[PDB]
Design a protein around this ligand. Sequence first.
Ligand SMILES: [Mg+2]
Ligand SMILES: [Mg+2]
Ligand SMILES: [Mn+2]
Ligand SMILES: [Mn+2]
Ligand SMILES: [Mn+2]
Ligand SMILES: [Mn+2]
Lengths: 86, 289, 289, 683, 683
Amino acid sequence: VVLADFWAPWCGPCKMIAPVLEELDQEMGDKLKIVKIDVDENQETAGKYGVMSIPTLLVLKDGEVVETSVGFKPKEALQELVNKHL
Amino acid sequence: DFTQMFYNQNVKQFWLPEEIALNGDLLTWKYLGKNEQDTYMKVLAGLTLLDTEQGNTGMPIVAEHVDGHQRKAVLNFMAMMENAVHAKSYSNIFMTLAPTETINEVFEWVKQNKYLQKKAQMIVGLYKAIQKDDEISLFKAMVASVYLESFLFYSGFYYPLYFYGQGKLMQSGEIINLILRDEAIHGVYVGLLAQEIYNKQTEEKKAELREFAIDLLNQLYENELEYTEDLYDQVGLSHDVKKFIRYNANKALMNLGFDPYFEEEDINPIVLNGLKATVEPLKDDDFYF
Amino acid sequence: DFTQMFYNQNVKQFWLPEEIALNGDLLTWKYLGKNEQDTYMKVLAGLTLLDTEQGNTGMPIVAEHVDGHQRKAVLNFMAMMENAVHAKSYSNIFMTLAPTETINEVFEWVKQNKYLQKKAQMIVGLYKAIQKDDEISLFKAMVASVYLESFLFYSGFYYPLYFYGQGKLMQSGEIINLILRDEAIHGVYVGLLAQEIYNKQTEEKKAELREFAIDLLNQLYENELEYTEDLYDQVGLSHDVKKFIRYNANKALMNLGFDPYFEEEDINPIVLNGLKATVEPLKDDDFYF
Amino acid sequence: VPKWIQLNNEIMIQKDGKFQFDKDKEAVHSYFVDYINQNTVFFHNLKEKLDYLVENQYYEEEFLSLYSFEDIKEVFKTAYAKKFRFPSFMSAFKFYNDYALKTNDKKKILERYEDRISIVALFFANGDTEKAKEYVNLMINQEYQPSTPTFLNAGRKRRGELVSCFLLEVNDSLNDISRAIDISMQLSKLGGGVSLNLSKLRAKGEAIKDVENATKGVVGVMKLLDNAFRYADQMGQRQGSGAAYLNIFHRDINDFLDTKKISADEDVRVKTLSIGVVIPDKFVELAREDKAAYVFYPHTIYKEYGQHMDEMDMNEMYDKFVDNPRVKKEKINPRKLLEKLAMLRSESGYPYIMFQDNVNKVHANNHISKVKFSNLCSEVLQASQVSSYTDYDEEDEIGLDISCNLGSLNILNVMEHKSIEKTVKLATDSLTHVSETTDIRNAPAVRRANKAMKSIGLGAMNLHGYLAQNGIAYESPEARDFANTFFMMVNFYSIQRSAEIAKEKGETFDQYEGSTYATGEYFDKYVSTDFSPKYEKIANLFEGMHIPTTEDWKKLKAFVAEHGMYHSYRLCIAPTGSISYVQSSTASVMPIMERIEERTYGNSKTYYPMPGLASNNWFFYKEAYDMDMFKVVDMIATIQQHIDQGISFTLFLKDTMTTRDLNRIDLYAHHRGIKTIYYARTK
Amino acid sequence: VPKWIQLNNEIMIQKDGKFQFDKDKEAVHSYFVDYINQNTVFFHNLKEKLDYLVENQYYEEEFLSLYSFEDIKEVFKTAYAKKFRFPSFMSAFKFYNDYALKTNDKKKILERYEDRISIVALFFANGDTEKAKEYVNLMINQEYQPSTPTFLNAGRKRRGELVSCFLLEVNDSLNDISRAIDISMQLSKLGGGVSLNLSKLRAKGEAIKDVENATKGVVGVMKLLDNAFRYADQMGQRQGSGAAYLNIFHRDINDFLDTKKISADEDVRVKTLSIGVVIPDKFVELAREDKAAYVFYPHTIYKEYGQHMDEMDMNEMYDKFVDNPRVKKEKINPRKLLEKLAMLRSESGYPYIMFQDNVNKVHANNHISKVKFSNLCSEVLQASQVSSYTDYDEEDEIGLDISCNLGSLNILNVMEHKSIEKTVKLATDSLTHVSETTDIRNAPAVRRANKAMKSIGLGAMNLHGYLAQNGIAYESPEARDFANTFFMMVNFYSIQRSAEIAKEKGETFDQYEGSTYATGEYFDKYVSTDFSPKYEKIANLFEGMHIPTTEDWKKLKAFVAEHGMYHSYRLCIAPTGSISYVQSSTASVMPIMERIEERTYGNSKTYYPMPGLASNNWFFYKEAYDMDMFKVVDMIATIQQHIDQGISFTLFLKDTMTTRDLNRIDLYAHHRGIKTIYYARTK
Ligand SMILES: [Mg+2]
Ligand SMILES: [Mg+2]
Ligand SMILES: [Mn+2]
Ligand SMILES: [Mn+2]
Ligand SMILES: [Mn+2]
Ligand SMILES: [Mn+2]
């Protein structure tokens, strides 16, 4: 189970989600991998997954996208989103 | 971002009734037909009655609930203009054109008139419904106030502007033009205060406030059409007055930061004739790369 | 018998601080001691607070409860003067003479000064205690307003007048004299309204109202003494100012129809020294000679 | 406060209930004992003075080289032999502050009154020592005064042009508009006031190359001209002054007028551009009958008829324009337009009023062109032909742009010397010389019309002063009788001098043969009506001077028929703003505005009583505002019947009278034959 | 609301979290099956259409008369054989609202896209049917796009001028100022944007013939030009646009800048005249060293040295100006002036910044003149010689006033067709034809410079579109490598076509012999440095096309030395504002402002996605405001090294950044060799 964060350095909401993902890694990092990808440097992956806004959070399970969340989310909402797929 | 600028514009527009001599209007008044004189009297009484509500309740109630010393001062100034300047000006026009008994009868008639009462009481109802520390009820009252200042007055203003654009009743028309110029800025200012509240709301609450504003506009507009036919059919002007109402409804909506509701229309030409980025010093080593 | 003449007097006294250029005071200000400048800033800040509340609260609330469109027009005009003209003029003075930090500090100082907070608490409390259709609560607030207009301002007015009388800070002093001229007529007018209510009462009720007025005056007076000492001891003038406020307390009582309460004293003579063309249409006979 | 200023302010201090007028004389002495003599540069001899002025680029070498030094010294001695003394402080102050030549540092006085007069006389004579002495005697007797440009700049190397009234015709094209802007800038650079006719320009909403609603109208051209006049302001010395004239039947006439309303926006109002309105008799007839008038689009008329709207007689063309479907027009109320004109004149004194038919029913050169507009002072009324300024590398069609030569007779000094004939002829000769010596290389039509028409303007001043010092009220019939006789003599001797110059040089003005002078029509009223004074007092005033009779006028008519006339135009009465001070005279033929005028120079106050004012003639020096404007109109019409061009006629109104009174004065002026109305000054 | 409007608005209604871009295509279909096909005017055959357009004064008959009707039919058939379809609604809407020919009442559509392209091609070919077919194939494939004036007005009777921009040099004289105003009005009447160099005009407080403190400075001329451009506003259709350029060492530079301050008074504020500032390397050096600089009075320098201040190199003459007592100067803080420039650009986007030394260190025609100013879009950088407009009746010394014809290559379509060479040569031929058939009869210096310089501007569009549609980030080094190679190819083939035209006509541009083209210096960096792509992806992008090497550049240098060059200037990258919509291309070489732009037309709103925008290339279409301005500067410098004229470089700034960031971007642009900076647009 992987939480992929599509972000950019200029994106205000993406700066707000960064500390939330660090807390989530401390609490769940034994069962959840967190991956960050910068859409300004990695346009091909952002295009492949059809991302058209940031932050976009993809929950992947064994390489397949099982859930998609757009915009800022608090920690508890990200935990609920990931715990469905653990 | 705006209160000091409006303060300036308001105080520099200060005027007094005594500045315009009214007696020379009798030289064109005597040449109008009975229907023209009747419509003028009724329109004038309509404006007078609505403006009194704004002076006694509308402006002071908004000044009471709005926070901010500078806003309260501007609002106080506007309330002063309603009560001390506009009200005396309307009285002066009446006393010049009609004898005392005629004035009393016109006000009795307009006081009982169904279409004038409907709109007057709708507006007053929203002012009476403002609750302490409730910005939603304040916003609704501000919408009502903007609709009065920027929309409801204009079915009335039409006629004095129509004469003024033809060279008739020029002294009272000059007075009306000064009044109208004050109401325009009042409407814009209260509109900005309403947008401030609106912008503090959620998206669902915003959609709900938009529905409120459009619904209120619709009720007032349908009554304005009836009010208009009631007064202006006898002088053959209702079609053109209706265009003027819609044009001013659109201005009122724009004052509230909303899109125009009605398609653009041309207005009667006679009435038209009457009408910093942050400075940061260069620190050196900005010239080297 | 009096409202119309007060209406005319108030509107003919209309002014804006921008009419007076203040850069002429720059040098006489620069030349004052630090103690003198401190007292001066604080004095005007205390005045600003009083006018802020008189404009925001006192005058509008009295206007709401007093019957008659002309009486309301006078009270609305007076309210506008308080916050749109008087309170603002002090900022014009501050912005000319003082750097922003000193201005910020003096406004912080009003918030934490116990005498200024106490007097505001007492006066505004009475304004907010007015009950609709209850003439006694209204009388009590009008007494409070007269005491603000004709007594409480004077611990503040002393110092600008004291300088004006010596030929110092004369532009600021001109503003202050205009403010004082307004407050004198405001105190008389509100006094006459208070007397109207008092005169409706039984002798027993009147006796209680005099007790209220005198108890309130004494309570305000005792607080004003402490305020005066706090401000004026550093400039050596506290005893002189105290004589001045007693003098004006008697004027406030007289505005209320009561006998003077303090004995007469000699006031500093410096402070006493501180006190378009007409248009006709063309006839067919004007084209022939 | 200087001593002379105290002595001048002592006039208002009343002794025995009377103003101390004589104290003013003492002030002059002080002004010369304390200031003028101290700051006047003196030389060991006139040769050294002339050498210093020529070498330091103060004077021109050419005009001084035409005389031997002995002749120049004799002319200066003739000027100084009069021992002229300024009678009032303001005369000397105005001369030595405005006209006396000063050093480059503006702290010393190089020219006295006699020096300036001698230099102007030497410039006028063009090499004739006797003629120079005659001019010196004319100007030191103060019988004739050259205009401010001529008086100030004659003989000076660092100078503007000697002509300051210029009238430009603007054709309906962008090339012509740009050329008009350029010429206005060039003439304002020379120091002249420029008047532009905008009637030929098509109105707002007309077609440019068959695209509709494209023209900005005359208001955009007025904005361009106003910017040009603001830019060209005599090298930052005086505010650039320009005038725009529009026919009242032009469509833009309202917007034109709207440029002078106080309520006008910043993109509508022009501040440094005076406006004048040309009112044909047709407009007055339409207003009189209350029939609604039509304002026409000039380009549609030009397309339909091939001529501009202002180039044809509207009296016979108005019905054809109205009945023509291809001519575009809008309905207007002429009485409302007249009331708007009166209201605007009450507010700001604008616009100037030109009664086209009043000008053109006595115009002698209607064959060349009808007078379509006036100057910035609304007294120059001459035929003008528009120019066709084409694109680059294409020959322009140069027309005629009016530029007349100003100079004023001092009626008091002329009549007390019994020298109407000599003064008029010498002034005509000086004006001819200045017109011949004027060469403007940036105004082609102005230069062509100066060479061809040879038009000069000989004015008069001190009429009210002369009448008041002779116990005659300005509004009295005796005053009008005197004006009639005096100006008929002025016209007679001006025509005689023009014919004599034509005979001497063997040439007349261009297209003279078609003029009413050649056909003898001009002299009709002169060969049938006797203009001798009808009052014994006026006849005694004219005692010692031969008054031309009908036989003399017949002889002059025959002389003009045989020899022609050198000047197309000879007489025009200019306002004479500041030269009236130096000459100690009342301004123009206007009545005095105030008996004693208060002025503020620097931080000092000064008092100028009207010339010759005393207790005996205090009542005769009636102020203009207190006078009946109908009688002022009558006097101005009496003078105008003997003036070929117009008279700068300012209305003097009280604040009490309404716009109806202003309109009545304008209509009585139109009825009485007044050609132009200059200003509506409200007291 | 129209059906196509609803379909276009359906793009933003997301389906499954993705924008409905394909709906846009549907909109175009609707826009054609409901509006265009119904509003089009169809004839029985092409003969009736051509006859109707000729007799009704829609088309010029001269250019059509050079072909037999069979050839015109073949050209139109070639245009229609491509079956061109607009891929977006906004492309067709923009063409049929701004460029398609309509009737006189604008109620019907007379010209389709193929009809307009055929007419433009027939005008370009000038009687050559095969050349007309080549132009048709070039434009219908959308490889090349003539500028808005040329595309809109070619072959039209009611057309304006085909030249987009004009640059005027204003000499320091009233005659020259008035002529500049006239020429500005004439060229704005023709529809072109006019730029005027005001650096030769003497500053405020200078002497006009020995009277000091007389000049109004460049601000008065600025007000005159502003009013002239307001008056001449394309017959009220498009607001008159003018540009004023002033050297930063002019004394009026502050007042100049004060014309654009939002707090400026009405007597100083100028609102319809864009402002540009020319900054030599000396000013940047002084600001870098924090040494107080000196602004100069141009007239004192001209008096002392005989040449204008902007006529010589400030880098070598600044110390001489400062140490010369006869030169008047004022002390300024160059860093404070830079901060004022940054603040002004943040507030209003003005002034344009022209780095004079960056322009002139690679300028090929410095012998004729140094580039002293730019055009209204700050991309034209050519030699200009000031004209001496003298008095009337005097011959004027006609100089060189810059004017070039614009045309943009569509980078995506050019590279997709692998036709850089053919497109560049055909575009050069079309621009040469546009220059040859341009004859302006009211701008003499513009006409002479067009005849002599033969300067053309060949731009490029859809750089960001091509990069994003090929998976290349605009800020990436791969994008800069592509720009380097592509624009080196464009320069190579433009020089080759210019030399071939010079050979076939036997004539070069005037004073070519002194240019760096004749001496071979221009080719130095091209005969020593290889500009082939350094990345494999870019090389694959350039596959099928012969990338010129150093040997090809040496052969081209020899060919130019033997035959010369027909065009003094060939490449200039204009903003290409509205014609980029029709070509379905991103504007110029600038990065896109937004991925989807919401524009309000009438009472409706429309959304235009960037060409080729989709899910896979969303983040490749990075918005310009989100981009690092330093990397955009790097891209623009990489392109500029191959462009002889300038590039309209708009800075895209965020609201958060300060004026110090803007100054840093400007200084990095100057360091990287950026010639001009167009706009500072803040999000
Ligand atoms: Mg034309
Ligand atoms: Mg020169
Ligand atoms: Mn009101
Ligand atoms: Mn209101
Ligand atoms: Mn107060
Ligand atoms: Mn008060």
